[PDB]
RNA sequence: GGAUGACCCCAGGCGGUAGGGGAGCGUUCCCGAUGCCGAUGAAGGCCGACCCGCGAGGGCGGCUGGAGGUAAGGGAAGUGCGAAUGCCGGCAUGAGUAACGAUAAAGAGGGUGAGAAUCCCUCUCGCCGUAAGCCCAAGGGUUCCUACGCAAUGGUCGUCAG
RNA sequence: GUGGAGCCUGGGAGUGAGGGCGCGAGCGAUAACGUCCGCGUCCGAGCGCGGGAACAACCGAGACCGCCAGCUAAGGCCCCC
RNA sequence: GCUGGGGCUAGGAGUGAAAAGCUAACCGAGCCCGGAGAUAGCUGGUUCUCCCCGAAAUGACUUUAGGGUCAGCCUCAGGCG
RNA sequence: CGUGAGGGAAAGGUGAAAAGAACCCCGGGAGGGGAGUGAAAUAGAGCCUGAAACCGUGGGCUUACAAGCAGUCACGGCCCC
RNA sequence: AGAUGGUAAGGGCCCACGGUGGAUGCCUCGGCACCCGAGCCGAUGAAGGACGUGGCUACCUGCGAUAAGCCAGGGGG
């Protein structure tokens, strides 16, 4: 069973799923946009608001709290001085999932796009 | 186990009243509001690039 | 009058690409296009050639009307097999059959 | 020389698949099932030729009695009475003057009646 | 585990070759024997 | 009965395994044949609700086929298949099922291309590290390098590759 | 008593595991779908046909073919029938 | 003690700290070819059609008893009547 | 295939003549559709004939309250001549 | 209240046409049997092979560093 159970197994073990998310967090955040299969995006998308949010606290304890995920200092510089601001009035959501229209060709996973809001 | 096995062979009738579930069933499809083409549902549509209004992506 | 084409000796076991020919048996050349793009299956690309492909017989060499096609016939023919050795255990060894169909589309023209 | 099986035994099969034209799967395509299944038919023909006419002598006498009752006597009696009279049209007639020509039938009855 | 066949030059050329038929009676009446069949091959071919 | 095998009439028999006997059908081949049928279509194939025969069969007709076939009467045999866990081959069923070969593990971006989860590049992640790295000897024999390919081989894909 | 009677001389066999039932015994336990002989019968080979619910051998009866005709056998005649 | 390379011993023979173990994935006697189409009183299988007839499963003997020889019983031909 | 002695296959046919299909069209190719050749191209090279099992497409009749070695006999409905 | 029809997810029988497959008929560059002819080769290195050999040559055939061939007689046109 499952009754009220959170959080996708995604066929990965603890520790893999988590290098997971934080792989996708990466390239996020990197490029701005990523595609991936639907489920991975979903999925995603809380993973990161999250790491956004404490980039709106600016503070010292928040970039060592995101730095842990994201193990990148550029990466966060980037997070805290660029990315963080556009999202000062905006209060959470700020990542958005569409699904694209073809499958993978090799094994028919839909695909979907996670990018940022503006 | 002691590897059971197929008593007798399946009649033409009986393997094809198996397969009587068997049909594809036609994909879902609606006219994008933009370029009229034909694409699923709550789909980015792939011929235009647009959903929900906008223009989303590159074609 | 009726354009035909037939892709010999493709290497896909029929019982799978009759499935997807099935889909687009009777329906208009323009549904048939819509329905084989969005198809999620191997066969769709096969079928979408053997059509697209009788339209430009249809309209090129029989002097019919690309906006008044539809697929009046369609059928998979089992071609020649190919044997292949599939090694089990204990020494055994198996045949797999790699299957091959005779894909054909024949288009009319739905008048009126 | 030699004389190989050659063009005989596939027209010897063919034969017998086309005698067995309408039989259910295999017994139609197979030339065994086929064979099997006329040898069964075959008995079957003469048997049910022997009682087709035990078949059709039951139905007339069921019709005979239902057509005698309604004239207050039942088929035993009518035959016994037929029998004194010496009146001797058989079942098969009977059973049609009882239902295509009843006056007739009456007739008969009252003969019958009047026999014994 | 270890099969049966364990190649070895040396040991195939000294055994089942052509010289070691030669030496003996029975190997010239291989070597007759396999002639007359026609064989392409008297001796196992092997490389050095 | 009449001339004897013409046909007719009267009467009686006619379930059948082991098995005895009798009469026939068809297949291959030889005489018949320096003949005859045959492109106005041989053999074989596919139909047939038609004809003859108890039957095995034989005709005839239509379609196929494209170069052979052979009569009356005789002769001679590798002469008739449904079974032998028969033999050879072909194709089914199980079935879109089990499986796709160590649970060291993946994610994204860029490129190429008709086509990319699978090829190249970059970044992130994980596995071995008395090895899952390196160097010899056996054995293997061009598998090495490069260009051009993807039908098959590759347990999927393939633009990649032993 | 003219019968698929009988006898004689030859050619060809197959069979040489029988079985149920009735009657007469032995063995057995006045058991066995038991076993072993005798007389007969059927099945075997009549698992063809009617009856016995169904059922080789119980009752009826020996099926050359055909008939949408008639008479019976055993068994039946309230409905299935 | 384990291990590489080079050698030697084999079919009624080798080798075996002995299990009839091992001698090229089946060893109370290896494999290949030959004798060879061994022999098999055993099991299986035996191919078109019609017509007539039509058994036996018993006796005797048998290293015989699920095989046989003779007789009995079937069939065909000639003869007797 | 076997270390070896040794074991040991499968696999023939376009047409009279290559006249073996220029060129165009869909396709990455394969494949096909026209054009052309030929007496014939369902003789097109996966090539004479092209049976059967087997797979499929179209049509007629039929089937979701019914009990089976799949037939057979009767009757009725529908479709065809 | 009563009664009787059109449903086919799929199945079955029949018909047409295909696919697959490679039987059958025809065919024969090959076999088989008998009969006749003929019958040894080798240190002057056989039988049998290895490796080579072509302007371009995988294999077969031929040939041998003079290598699909060199010399001469005969045949043939
Ligand atoms: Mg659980
Ligand atoms: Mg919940
Ligand atoms: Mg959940
Ligand atoms: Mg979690
Ligand atoms: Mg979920
Ligand atoms: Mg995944
Ligand atoms: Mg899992
Ligand atoms: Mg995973
Ligand atoms: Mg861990
Ligand atoms: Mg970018
Ligand atoms: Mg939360
Ligand atoms: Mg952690
Ligand atoms: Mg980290
Ligand atoms: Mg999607
Ligand atoms: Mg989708
Ligand atoms: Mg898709
Ligand atoms: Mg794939
Ligand atoms: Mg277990
Ligand atoms: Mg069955
Ligand atoms: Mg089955
Ligand atoms: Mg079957
Ligand atoms: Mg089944
Ligand atoms: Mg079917
Ligand atoms: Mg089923
Ligand atoms: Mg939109
Ligand atoms: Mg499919
Ligand atoms: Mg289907
Ligand atoms: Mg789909
Ligand atoms: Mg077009
Ligand atoms: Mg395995
Ligand atoms: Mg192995
Ligand atoms: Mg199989
Ligand atoms: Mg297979
Ligand atoms: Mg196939
Ligand atoms: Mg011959
Ligand atoms: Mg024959
Ligand atoms: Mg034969
Ligand atoms: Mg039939
Ligand atoms: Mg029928
Ligand atoms: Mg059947
Ligand atoms: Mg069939
Ligand atoms: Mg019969
Ligand atoms: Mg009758
Ligand atoms: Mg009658
Ligand atoms: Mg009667
Ligand atoms: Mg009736
Ligand atoms: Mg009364
Ligand atoms: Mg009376
Ligand atoms: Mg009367
Ligand atoms: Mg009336
Ligand atoms: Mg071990
Ligand atoms: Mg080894
Ligand atoms: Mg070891
Ligand atoms: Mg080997
Ligand atoms: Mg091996
Ligand atoms: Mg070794
Ligand atoms: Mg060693
Ligand atoms: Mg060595
Ligand atoms: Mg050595
Ligand atoms: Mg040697
Ligand atoms: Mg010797
Ligand atoms: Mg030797
Ligand atoms: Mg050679
Ligand atoms: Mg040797
Ligand atoms: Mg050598
Ligand atoms: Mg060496
Ligand atoms: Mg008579
Ligand atoms: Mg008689
Ligand atoms: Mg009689
Ligand atoms: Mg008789
Ligand atoms: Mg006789
Ligand atoms: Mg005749
Ligand atoms: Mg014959
Ligand atoms: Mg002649
Ligand atoms: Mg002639
Ligand atoms: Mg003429
Ligand atoms: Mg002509
Ligand atoms: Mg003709
Ligand atoms: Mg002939
Ligand atoms: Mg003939
Ligand atoms: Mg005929
Ligand atoms: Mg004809
Ligand atoms: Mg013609
Ligand atoms: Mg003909
Ligand atoms: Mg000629
Ligand atoms: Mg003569
Ligand atoms: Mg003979
Ligand atoms: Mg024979
Ligand atoms: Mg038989
Ligand atoms: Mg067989
Ligand atoms: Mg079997
Ligand atoms: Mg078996
Ligand atoms: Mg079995
Ligand atoms: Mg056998
Ligand atoms: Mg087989
Ligand atoms: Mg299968
Ligand atoms: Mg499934
Ligand atoms: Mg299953
Ligand atoms: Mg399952
Ligand atoms: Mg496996
Ligand atoms: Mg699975
Ligand atoms: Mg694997
Ligand atoms: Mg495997
Ligand atoms: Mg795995
Ligand atoms: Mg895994
Ligand atoms: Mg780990
Ligand atoms: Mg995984
Ligand atoms: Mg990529
Ligand atoms: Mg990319
Ligand atoms: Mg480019
Ligand atoms: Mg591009
Ligand atoms: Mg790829
Ligand atoms: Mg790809
Ligand atoms: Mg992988
Ligand atoms: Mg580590
Ligand atoms: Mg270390
Ligand atoms: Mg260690
Ligand atoms: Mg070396
Ligand atoms: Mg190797
Ligand atoms: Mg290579
Ligand atoms: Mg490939
Ligand atoms: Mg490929
Ligand atoms: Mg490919
Ligand atoms: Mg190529
Ligand atoms: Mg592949
Ligand atoms: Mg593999
Ligand atoms: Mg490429
Ligand atoms: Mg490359
Ligand atoms: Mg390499
Ligand atoms: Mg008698
Ligand atoms: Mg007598
Ligand atoms: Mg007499
Ligand atoms: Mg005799
Ligand atoms: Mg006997
Ligand atoms: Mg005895
Ligand atoms: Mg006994
Ligand atoms: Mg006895
Ligand atoms: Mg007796
Ligand atoms: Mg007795
Ligand atoms: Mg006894
Ligand atoms: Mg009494
Ligand atoms: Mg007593
Ligand atoms: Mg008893
Ligand atoms: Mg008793
Ligand atoms: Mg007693
Ligand atoms: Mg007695
Ligand atoms: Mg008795
Ligand atoms: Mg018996
Ligand atoms: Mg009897
Ligand atoms: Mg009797
Ligand atoms: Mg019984
Ligand atoms: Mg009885
Ligand atoms: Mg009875
Ligand atoms: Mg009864
Ligand atoms: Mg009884
Ligand atoms: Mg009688
Ligand atoms: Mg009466
Ligand atoms: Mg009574
Ligand atoms: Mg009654
Ligand atoms: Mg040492
Ligand atoms: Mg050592
Ligand atoms: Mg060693
Ligand atoms: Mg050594
Ligand atoms: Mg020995
Ligand atoms: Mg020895
Ligand atoms: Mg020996
Ligand atoms: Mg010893
Ligand atoms: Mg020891
Ligand atoms: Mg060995
Ligand atoms: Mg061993
Ligand atoms: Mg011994
Ligand atoms: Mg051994
Ligand atoms: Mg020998
Ligand atoms: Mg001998
Ligand atoms: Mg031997
Ligand atoms: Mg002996
Ligand atoms: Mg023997
Ligand atoms: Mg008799
Ligand atoms: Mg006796
Ligand atoms: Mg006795
Ligand atoms: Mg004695
Ligand atoms: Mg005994
Ligand atoms: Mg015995
Ligand atoms: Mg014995
Ligand atoms: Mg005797
Ligand atoms: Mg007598
Ligand atoms: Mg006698
Ligand atoms: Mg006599
Ligand atoms: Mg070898
Ligand atoms: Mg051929
Ligand atoms: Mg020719
Ligand atoms: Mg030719
Ligand atoms: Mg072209
Ligand atoms: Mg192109
Ligand atoms: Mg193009
Ligand atoms: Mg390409
Ligand atoms: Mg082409
Ligand atoms: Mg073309
Ligand atoms: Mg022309
Ligand atoms: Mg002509
Ligand atoms: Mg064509
Ligand atoms: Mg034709
Ligand atoms: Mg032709
Ligand atoms: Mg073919
Ligand atoms: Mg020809
Ligand atoms: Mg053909
Ligand atoms: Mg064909
Ligand atoms: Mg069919
Ligand atoms: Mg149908
Ligand atoms: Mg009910
Ligand atoms: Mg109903
Ligand atoms: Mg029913
Ligand atoms: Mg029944
Ligand atoms: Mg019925
Ligand atoms: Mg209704
Ligand atoms: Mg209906
Ligand atoms: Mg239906
Ligand atoms: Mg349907
Ligand atoms: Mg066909
Ligand atoms: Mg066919
Ligand atoms: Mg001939
Ligand atoms: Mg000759
Ligand atoms: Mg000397
Ligand atoms: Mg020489
Ligand atoms: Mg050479
Ligand atoms: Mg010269
Ligand atoms: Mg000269
Ligand atoms: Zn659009």
């Known amino acids: 069973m499952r009754h009220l159970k959170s959080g996708r197994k995604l066929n990965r073990h603890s520790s893999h799923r988590l290098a997971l998310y934080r792989n996708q967090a990466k390239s996020l955040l990197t490029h701005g946009r990523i595609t991936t299969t639907v489920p991975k995006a979903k999925e995603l998308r809380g993973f990161v608001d999250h790491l956004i949010h404490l980039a709106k606290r600016g503070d010292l304890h928040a970039r060592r709290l995101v730095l842990r995920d994201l193990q990148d200092v550029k990466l966060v510089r980037k997070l805290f001085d660029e990315i963080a601001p556009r999202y000062r009035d905006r209060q959470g959501g700020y990542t958005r999932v569409l699904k694209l229209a073809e499958r993978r060709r090799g094994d028919g996973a839909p695909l979907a796009l996670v990018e940022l809001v503006e | 186990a002691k590897h059971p096995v197929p008593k007798k062979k399946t009649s033409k009738a009986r393997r094809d009243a198996r397969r009587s579930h068997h049909a594809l069933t036609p994909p879902t499809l609606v006219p994008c509001p933009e370029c009229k083409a034909m694409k699923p549902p709550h789909t980015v549509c792939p011929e235009c690039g647009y959903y929900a209004g906008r223009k989303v992506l590159e074609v | ?112 | 020389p030699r004389a190989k099986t050659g063009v005989v035994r596939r027209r010897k099969h063919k034969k017998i698949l086309k005698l067995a034209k309408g039989y259910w799967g295999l017994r139609s395509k197979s030339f065994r099932k086929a064979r099997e299944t006329l040898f069964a038919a075959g008995n079957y023909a003469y048997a049910h030729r022997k009682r087709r006419k035990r078949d059709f002598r039951r139905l007339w006498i069921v019709r005979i009695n239902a057509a005698c009752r309604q004239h207050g006597l039942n088929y035993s009696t009518f035959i016994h009475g037929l029998k004194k009279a010496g009146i001797e049209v058989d079942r098969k007639n009977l059973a049609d003057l009882a239902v295509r020509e009843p006056q007739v039938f009456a007739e008969l009855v009252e003969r019958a009646k009047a026999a014994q | 585990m270890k099969r049966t066949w364990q190649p070895n030059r040396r040991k195939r050329a000294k055994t089942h070759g052509f010289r070691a038929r030669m030496r003996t009676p029975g190997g010239r009446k291989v070597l007759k024997r396999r002639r007359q069949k026609g064989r392409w091959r008297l001796t196992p071919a092997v490389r050095k």
């Open chain 3, 1 to 112: 009058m009726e354009a035909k084409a037939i892709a010999r000796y493709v290497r896909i076991s029929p019982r799978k690409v009759r499935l997807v020919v099935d889909l687009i048996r009777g329906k208009s050349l323009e549904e048939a296009r819509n329905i084989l793009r969005y198809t999620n299956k191997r066969g769709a690309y096969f079928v979408a050639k053997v059509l697209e492909s009788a339209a430009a017989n249809a309209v090129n060499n029989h002097d019919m009307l690309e906006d008044r096609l539809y697929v009046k016939a369609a059928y998979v023919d089992e071609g020649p097999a190919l044997k292949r050795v599939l090694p089990r255990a204990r020494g055994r060894a198996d045949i797999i059959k790699k299957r091959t169909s005779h894909i054909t589309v024949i288009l009319g023209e739905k008048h009126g």
